[PDB]
Amino acid sequence: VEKVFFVTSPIYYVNAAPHIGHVYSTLITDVIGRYHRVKGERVFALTGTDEHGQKVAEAAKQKQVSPYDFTTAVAGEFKKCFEQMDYSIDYFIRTTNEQHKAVVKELWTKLEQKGDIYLGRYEGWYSISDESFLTPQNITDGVDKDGNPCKVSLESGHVVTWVSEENYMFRLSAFRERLLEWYHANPGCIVPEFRRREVIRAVEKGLPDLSVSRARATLHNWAIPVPGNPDHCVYVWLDALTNYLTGSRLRVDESGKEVSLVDDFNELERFPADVHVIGKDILKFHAIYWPAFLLSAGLPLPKKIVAHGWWTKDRKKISKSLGNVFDPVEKAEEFGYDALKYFLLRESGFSDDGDYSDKNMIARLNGELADTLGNLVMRCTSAKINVNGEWPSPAAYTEEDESLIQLIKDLPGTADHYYLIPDIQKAIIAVFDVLRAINAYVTDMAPWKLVKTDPERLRTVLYITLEGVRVTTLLLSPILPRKSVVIFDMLGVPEVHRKGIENFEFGAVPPGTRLGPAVEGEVLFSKRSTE
Ligand code: MET
């Protein structure tokens, strides 16, 4: 099917200011979107904020201010942060949006009409901080803010509380068999593979029904009322997950402001998501609850859920209270935006919990960005080596030349598959494997010596080098968006050849193309003092 490629991040609780976790989730979403735009596809990338619920409402009361004023303020901080991070998100959704609210009521009514919502009770544990229902197998003993003994989530360590309430219940138990069919029939639907196995095991063990409303008082009336029953509010998670459907149905103007909500998602050709980017903490909501609601409502299921891991700094938990911070905008101003994005995407795979340190960040910046990529770009554009400031016409290729050309020809296919898993780390590693091979080749051929000794041979070496850089840069462009433009400028690559699968082919830029102009002190990535 030809269709708008639809990629999403979670929508983030606005109980607190934005931080690395949010920036990372949205980065992954942004990169996936950027790559598909580079392939020439229509892309709609979504992010935003989750603004209802007890968690948020009680965060606002702690700051002694109105929930409307509080959410709007913090939502503005999330936007400012994402603007500063230089993402290419198509829309920023807020669950306070009135059009979103209409979609929630619409979905709720669909589930009710389908017979999958009934009036029951939940008597059990709840984590307000995770807005999550827990069974007694998932709590243990712990300590609250005071120091008193209490119960806490095994999953997250936050304080749990006992809830006994007459609630509207969704028949999640009735979807066990169909969810299992879905997971089996689509073995690529959850990534990485071990989290897919985690989900299957959980659903195999059995599913209870899920409380999809709460009494209005306990949410401090900060939620969407249940259609036909003003005494109840919709479960913040059913509300939240619906953002993906809302987003798929919003027409957005040039400025990024929402202007219209269509009736039928087919109208905008986005739904269902091709990739839901999420953190491991919220897997069950997306891989169990979400598809169950969609199945009930007769809506199509997402194609892929990708769940990444948690971050630490110097092998310690990131926390303002513990005295170990990681401000992304600060580190970006220190080391560069593209470089910081490279590091976060390179350093950790989705299977792992990543670890920043200034030491490791400087090693990759110097080692990979400067010594490997940057050094190569300067060499093939140098007036000392490339004396006519153009793309030369290659002479006959040696077997060594062709071994390199082969790697470059194969790179797009390989990087493509990795981006579609998606596994951004492996894609980056693949591109840099080819970059290391180009450097070895250049070291081997010594083009600086060829300038005087064998100009005809230099044409070949120089042409292959320029073309390897172009291709490696194109495939890295979703990761180093600003620097890829500088590189393409330096190579003098026309705009048209900077996107499209056509330009994945070796030899897309013709000989005689003139390099862009030099600058007296310019350099792509500057080496940082080794500390
Ligand atoms: C449907 S994505 C909701 C994510 C949730 N607000 C969180 O921050 O974990």
Side-chain angles (χ1 to χ4, degrees), residues 1-451 453-531:
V1 283
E2 170 49 36
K3 173 195 181 291
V4 182
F5 182 92
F6 184 31
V7 62
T8 71
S9 81
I11 54 164
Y12 310 111
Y13 290 123
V14 292
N15 61 301
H19 59 69
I20 190 65
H22 308 124
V23 160
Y24 180 64
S25 280
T26 300
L27 177 58
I28 292 162
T29 303
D30 187 50
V31 171
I32 291 168
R34 281 171 179 282
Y35 177 64
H36 288 270
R37 289 199 205 90
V38 159
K39 289 179 73 167
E41 295 170 14
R42 295 180 279 163
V43 172
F44 188 78
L46 182 63
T47 194
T49 51
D50 186 353
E51 314 193 339
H52 292 136
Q54 196 173 354
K55 184 186 176 79
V56 168
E58 295 193 337
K61 185 48 154 284
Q62 289 277 47
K63 302 298 192 199
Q64 306 199 85
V65 72
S66 177
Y68 301 85
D69 286 330
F70 181 75
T71 53
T72 304
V74 180
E77 288 180 319
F78 271 80
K79 291 187 169 179
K80 199 210 193 91
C81 178
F82 292 175
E83 279 157 39
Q84 195 63 241
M85 282 297 104
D86 193 31
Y87 297 141
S88 180
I89 307 307
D90 293 291
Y91 186 68
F92 188 107
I93 190 164
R94 294 181 57 191
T95 58
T96 46
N97 181 274
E98 201 69 6
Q99 280 58 249
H100 172 70
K101 238 164 274 193
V103 177
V104 171
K105 290 172 177 190
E106 208 182 277
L107 180 69
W108 175 282
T109 296
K110 191 58 163 193
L111 305 176
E112 195 284 326
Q113 289 175 336
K114 188 76 188 196
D116 294 317
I117 291 188
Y118 66 94
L119 190 63
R121 286 188 81 74
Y122 181 78
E123 307 194 11
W125 295 104
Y126 194 71
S127 170
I128 292 168
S129 195
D130 310 304
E131 299 277 27
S132 175
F133 294 103
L134 298 166
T135 56
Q137 291 62 61
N138 290 124
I139 79 175
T140 192
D141 290 288
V143 180
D144 58 355
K145 70 197 189 181
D146 286 42
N148 286 322
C150 67
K151 301 300 197 161
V152 299
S153 170
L154 267 169
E155 296 170 351
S156 69
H158 291 293
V159 171
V160 299
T161 40
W162 187 267
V163 166
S164 186
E165 277 180 28
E166 181 166 284
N167 286 171
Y168 283 100
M169 305 290 295
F170 172 72
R171 297 186 192 284
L172 179 64
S173 67
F175 290 91
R176 182 173 176 277
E177 221 180 330
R178 279 172 283 171
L179 284 172
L180 288 179
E181 272 139 40
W182 184 56
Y183 308 135
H184 164 93
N186 307 267
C189 72
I190 294 163
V191 175
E193 177 64 7
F194 78 91
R195 306 213 152 100
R196 177 172 163 270
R197 289 198 307 271
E198 279 164 16
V199 169
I200 294 167
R201 270 192 298 276
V203 178
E204 283 278 13
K205 285 204 74 81
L207 293 175
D209 292 342
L210 175 66
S211 165
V212 287
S213 84
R214 301 293 295 282
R216 82 184 175 93
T218 149
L219 301 201
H220 307 292
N221 292 274
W222 190 240
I224 301 171
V226 163
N229 197 333
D231 291 1
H232 294 243
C233 317
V234 177
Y235 179 25
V236 66
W237 267 102
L238 175 47
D239 165 3
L241 291 160
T242 303
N243 93 93
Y244 302 132
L245 175 57
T246 306
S248 80
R249 286 175 50 182
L250 291 181
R251 282 196 206 273
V252 180
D253 69 26
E254 192 71 15
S255 148
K257 174 172 156 56
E258 171 264 295
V259 296
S260 172
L261 174 71
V262 305
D263 303 308
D264 174 30
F265 69 83
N266 297 280
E267 191 157 8
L268 298 178
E269 307 158 78
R270 297 171 188 160
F271 206 79
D274 296 276
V275 178
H276 287 302
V277 177
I278 61 161
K280 63 189 183 166
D281 55 312
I282 57 171
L283 185 55
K284 70 168 180 173
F285 306 101
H286 286 83
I288 302 174
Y289 300 170
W290 181 223
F293 297 133
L294 296 171
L295 286 156
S296 178
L299 293 173
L301 303 199
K303 298 285 157 187
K304 288 179 193 298
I305 299 159
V306 51
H308 59 73
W310 273 328
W311 276 95
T312 59
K313 188 172 180 292
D314 302 316
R315 308 173 201 168
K316 303 182 183 200
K317 175 58 187 148
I318 295 172
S319 185
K320 186 64 180 173
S321 51
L322 299 172
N324 183 23
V325 191
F326 189 52
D327 193 322
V329 175
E330 195 216 50
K331 294 282 169 185
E333 293 282 303
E334 191 167 14
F335 298 110
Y337 290 83
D338 282 2
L340 176 61
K341 293 172 178 186
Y342 170 81
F343 180 85
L344 297 174
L345 296 168
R346 176 58 182 80
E347 178 55 27
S348 195
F350 303 147
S351 288
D352 313 299
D353 279 22
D355 198 46
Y356 183 88
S357 70
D358 290 327
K359 190 169 194 285
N360 293 339
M361 168 78 216
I362 284 161
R364 291 199 183 283
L365 170 53
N366 291 348
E368 293 127 52
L369 295 183
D371 286 340
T372 297
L373 173 55
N375 172 62
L376 196 55
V377 175
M378 302 304 290
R379 265 163 158 184
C380 64
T381 56
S382 170
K384 179 184 132 199
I385 289 153
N386 187 335
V387 309
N388 295 303
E390 70 172 19
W391 285 58
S393 189
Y397 295 134
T398 65
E399 261 299 324
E400 177 158 356
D401 294 338
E402 279 173 15
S403 68
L404 181 56
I405 290 159
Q406 196 83 317
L407 297 180
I408 296 164
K409 281 186 166 168
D410 292 355
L411 177 55
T414 287
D416 182 65
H417 290 301
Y418 289 131
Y419 273 120
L420 295 182
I421 286 164
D423 191 327
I424 292 157
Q425 196 190 45
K426 285 195 202 310
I428 294 164
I429 288 171
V431 175
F432 275 79
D433 284 349
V434 173
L435 286 173
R436 284 184 276 278
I438 299 166
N439 274 285
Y441 171 79
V442 171
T443 288
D444 215 65
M445 296 294 132
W448 51 89
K449 280 177 167 154
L450 293 178
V451 169
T453 300
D454 196 351
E456 180 180 307
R457 184 71 191 126
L458 180 58
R459 292 202 266 108
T460 309
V461 176
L462 200 56
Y463 174 75
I464 294 162
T465 310
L466 287 160
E467 182 65 1
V469 172
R470 185 192 68 77
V471 169
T472 54
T473 298
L474 186 58
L475 292 161
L476 286 171
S477 71
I479 286 141
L480 309 161
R482 296 299 185 183
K483 294 290 167 183
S484 64
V485 168
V486 175
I487 293 161
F488 286 146
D489 282 351
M490 287 178 182
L491 299 185
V493 171
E495 269 297 293
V496 62
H497 295 298
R498 301 182 183 201
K499 69 175 287 184
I501 63 101
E502 296 96 344
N503 301 300
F504 282 14
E505 302 227 55
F506 180 89
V509 173
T513 300
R514 247 167 286 180
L515 294 188
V519 179
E520 268 204 25
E522 67 177 321
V523 65
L524 274 155
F525 300 97
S526 68
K527 280 224 182 88
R528 282 277 295 185
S529 182
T530 185
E531 299 175 78

